Write a protein that binds this ligand. Structure first.
Ligand SMILES: [Zn+2]
Ligand SMILES: [Zn+2]
Ligand SMILES: [Zn+2]
Length: 178
């Protein structure tokens, strides 16, 4: 197994996957690593299993159909994975905790949003459709772009949004287009 966390790339108290070589800090994995369960499979392995069990799930989909899906156990999982994939990029640190807004010439957003909040929302089953999740994720980056305006710092929002959007198209098998 790996001797660093797959999400944060640091050593420490790590839990190892039994079906692949990845390892996790307890609260880096999403969901948080389960108390018992021997063997234990990580979220990467659980996602691989869904694809394998139903190969047609990898055929192209329309975003509009994906968004309306109810948050049944498999959509719940895929949204947890997608979130995780954002936390895996180090630039996610800028969006993890609750922001504040005091900049000459800007006003804060009407509806602040941050990754840890989306994390808690998923954990508390507050989203009924994939749409709920995807809207709060996109809101993170949109709020950033709007606030930071022409400061080059806006680029961090573009960069982490690109990671989110690529992972979203991959995980939910969105139909490739030009
Ligand atoms: Zn970690
Ligand atoms: Zn695994
Ligand atoms: Zn099938």
């Amino acid at each position: 197994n790996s001797n660093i966390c797959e999400v944060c790339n640091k050593w420490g108290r790590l839990f190892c996957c039994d079906t692949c070589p990845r390892s996790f800090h307890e609260h880096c994995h999403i969901p948080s690593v389960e108390a018992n369960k021997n063997p234990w499979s990580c979220i990467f392995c659980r996602i691989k299993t869904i694809q394998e069990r139903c190969p047609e799930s990898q055929s192209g989909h329309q975003e509009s159909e994906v968004l309306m899906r109810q948050m049944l156990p498999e959509e719940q999982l895929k949204c947890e994975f997608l979130l995780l994939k954002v936390y895996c990029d180090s630039k996610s640190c800028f969006f993890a905790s609750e922001p504040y807004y005091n900049r000459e010439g800007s006003q804060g957003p009407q509806k602040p949003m941050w990754l840890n909040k989306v994390k808690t929302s998923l954990n508390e089953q507050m989203y009924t459709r994939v749409e709920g999740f995807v809207q709060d994720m996109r809101l993170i980056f949109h709020n950033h772009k709007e606030f930071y305006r022409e400061d080059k710092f806006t680029r961090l929002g573009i960069q982490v949004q690109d990671i989110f959007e690529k992972n979203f198209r991959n995980i939910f098998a969105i139909q490739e287009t030009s």
